[model samples]
Target chain A: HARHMLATSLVTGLDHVGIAVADLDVAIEWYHDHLGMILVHEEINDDQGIREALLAVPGSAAQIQLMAPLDESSVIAKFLDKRGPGIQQLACRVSDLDAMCRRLRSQGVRLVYETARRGTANSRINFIHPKDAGGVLIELVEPAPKLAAAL
Target chain B: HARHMLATSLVTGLDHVGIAVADLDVAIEWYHDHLGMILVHEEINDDQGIREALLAVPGSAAQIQLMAPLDESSVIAKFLDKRGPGIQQLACRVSDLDAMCRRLRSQGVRLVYETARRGTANSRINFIHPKDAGGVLIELVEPAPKLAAA
Candidate 1:
């Protein structure tokens, strides 16, 4: 079961690398034009106050998520003001998001999202706060059940 | 040709992600115990004044390279003092290293290493300074020819 994998501390691989950008469109274009990465998904999370774009390396499932604040009040906007655009979070694929979150909690890890939430590319995800992760936001993801089943 | 693929901007994928830490062994142990990342390599580069460890995600070519300074004078030590241990650089694999460097240079992008140098995993690599990369230290890597040929 996926639960067993988490208990044993198994990390499958990276899900996506998140980068904070001032302009999503410009960042998307730069990656497309210079790195040859393909834009695969784009969406705005009003709740989070940001617009995000997902780009993939031509032949890999791994992705890069570029996030741009929806407004000046958005946290991402503040991040820009302080640090400019850069790597913001690292998402790692896990066998089971729920079990992983529980384990982390039991171990006293502070999580930004204690429960799994819908993520880009139809995955279930959660974030471990930067303070708990040595200043890097860490995302734990579990691919959609159907996607995992197919693979 | 790989060069042609590069001209069109086709990055193959991530080679590794770099994180600067205060202590190499402690950081390596944390990742290994918590995320199940396997420590694949460890080395000390006196030139850079840092000791590093490479951890691999099971079933993937991608890796995480954790670095710690050998002394206070090291760049990593300075980074730790100023910002603390955290993600430092994102390294991407390219089809053609030489061509990619030229493309970045022609565009007037500032590079930390103007020429490719020996990198971990026996790859030829260079760094795109943070100023040109929206505050992220980006590493462009080309696998060594022998490994590439294999």
Candidate 2:
């Protein structure tokens, strides 16, 4: 009953590298020219109020999302002001975001982004604050079945 | 010959994550507070000119190394000046360093440490420039063989 009821726990490889850039276009060009990854998507989200360029590694689910602020209050804007441009988060793919959050919380790990938001792959996402994740922001992404099916 | 070589080609997981910090003590405290990693070793290399703290991650060879620069001219120092204290290199354990360097060089990749140097755990290591490795410095490590006597 235990084996049948429980889903096989899985924590996959890095899902994406989210970098906060001072200029999204410059970051996109640097990534494209230096690495073989292709710029597959670009958008300026009004909700999050940021400009983003999603670059994907060929034949891999892993990608890098370059974000620049479109609004003053956005965190990306502050990051730009303070650090210029650099890796903001390292996202790891998980099969169960809710379960992971519960487990971490039970262990006294603080979480952020309690509400699951849209991620680079258009999947539900949440974040664990750096204060709990060893000075690094951890983003959790559940594999979207529909997106996987289409891919 | 091919079959004989293939049998020993299997490898372990990640080797290490290199991070630059302003203060090694503060960084160590932060990791201990958040991740609960027991730091295993600390070394101040005058040649490399950096103070290093190695944090152990249980059940994995992939440890995180927190580094503080002693040299003002260090590349890491420059990185810190531009970007705040953060991850500097992602070191991966590999079967061969020379082969990997040659492969990357052929792809127009630049090497930061052109020659492999003696690393912790007796591994031979080399760094590929961040510009070549998706804006992330990559380190290739070839582990040393443990003597049967030990």
Candidate 3:
């Protein structure tokens, strides 16, 4: 009974590491050529506002997303301006978005992106302000089980 | 058969996040209080030469270790000097340390500590240089099940 109860948790895994870079091209090259990570996918999001490249790592469920804030008007862009280039977000794979948000909100945590929005290319994702989840901004992405199985 | 082989091949989970911090105490406080994570344990290791505190989020397998270099002569101390307060290591939990070391060795990766040594009186642990793991110093610690279980 205890094991069964523990298995129904909201979050499953740490999905990806979002690194904010001053020069996206340079960071991509270093992670690709030197680290031997395979560049899996790329996207430029106009709505949420960022240019991101995904790298598939070997022998690990983990992946690194190289992100550059697109809009000078976006919060991420302001973060880069103030803090310089570094790790910007910690992405976690969660099963339920609304439920998790309510739980965190009840605990007095604030959300930067309150509503669940379909992310670039169509994955549902939400954001918790870095101030709420430590100094690092965190994105909780609902997993596409079929897509993850392919990964 | 191929799918099973692939699963066996890629042994990956979060290696630990190597946060660079000016003070370990402050970091641990944030992790415990703000994050609502439980403190697993804390200790001072003179071998690798640093003080460490581990905290894990409830119902989450991933955990973060807050390490502050204690010795000016230690490698971490030098890292702190050069990089300032930030992540010093990104460690991965491997199933078999011996096999993982051997495989990394075949790839020409440098090992900081080859044999598992007692860490603050518990389980076996080792480290892989950051040069091998993309400038992130990596530590592999297998805490004894009896004591290390958070």
Candidate 4:
């Protein structure tokens, strides 16, 4: 019987560390060959304008997301042009997207998207605006329904 | 029989995300008051030159480390001066410090320290040079013997 939940009531767990890279394959190989991490998932997300891969240490639920731009106009490209390849954002897993958005909005927090959008592995995702989030881009993700149930 | 392990043989798991902030307590409050995360540990490590707090979602082992500089000459201070408050480094846990350092050197990899130094909670730690590990500073931490043993 709790009330007055905070806006971050949106978070369930830290999802993955998103990294902006110049080349996805090279980055993938680097983590695998050096760290013994395994490549668990990979895909091209055109809407997000990037090619991405997910990696994890053996037997770990946490992941590292490596993303490379699809073209020059991509946000990843812009980030590269401005800051070079590096840690881009830290993502958190959420159970419910709509409710989280409402909670955030009720608290006067801004989001990059007014509505949830498709994300990695077909999940719903949105971002907390960098300025409002202390200069760090924070992503809130809700895994697809079936996947959510499996997890 | 296996041989020729990679340098990252050092990693047991992703330990925590290190963030550089201007104020430790403020960052602590922000994560807790906003994200529903809980504070598990807090301390000032003069060797690391920062006051730090470790936070995590309930029932989670992985954490977010919020660090603020202790003084002007601190590395965290320089990071804030150059890049502003943001994600600073990503840390991975390891079981053996000496062996990991050996594997890295054998692979011709460059590290930030010639010898591992004391880290959070007395863990032995070192860093892989950012130039060699993409542009991200990657920390290799071997938790204090007793801490990991427990």
Best model number under lDDT? 4
Candidate 4 lDDT, tens digit per residue, B1-150? 011223346577677899888767877887787678777788888887888898866534467888899998888898889778889888888878788778887877789998898877778899988999878888898888675636
Q: Which pairs in model 1 have colliding backbones?
A: A36-B9
- For candidate 4 chain B, which ten residues in a row score worst on lDDT? B1-10
All candidates: TM-score: 0.86, 0.60, 0.62, 0.89
lDDT of 4: 0.80
Greater lDDT among 2 and 3 belongs to: 2
**Proportion of native contacts found in each model?**
0.47, 0.00, 0.10, 0.36
Candidate 2 lDDT over B2-112, as tens digits, reads 112222211223466677878789779766554445578888755567778987644233567788888887767887776657767655566777876776677687877
Tens-place lDDT per residue, model 1, B42-121, is 98877668889998777556788899989999878877897788777888888788888888777777678867777775
lDDT (10s digit) by residue, model 3, range A108-138: 8777776887654466788877655445466
Ranking of all candidate structures by their DockQ, best first: 1, 4, 3, 2
Report DockQ per prediction, comma-separated: 0.40, 0.12, 0.19, 0.33
Stretches of model 1 off by over 4 angstroms after superposition: A1-8, A145-151, B1-7, B145-150
Which prediction has the highest DockQ against the true structure?
Answer: 1
Report lDDT per candidate: 0.78, 0.65, 0.62, 0.80
Name the better of 1 and 3 by lDDT. 1
Q: Report the number of backbone clashes for model 3.
A: 12
Tens digit of per-residue lDDT, candidate 4, span A88-130: 8998888887888787777777889988888888888999888
- Cα lDDT tens digits, model 3, B36-114, are 5556678887876878887654444556666778878766688567645544554555566677677767767678776
Number of clashes in model 1? 1
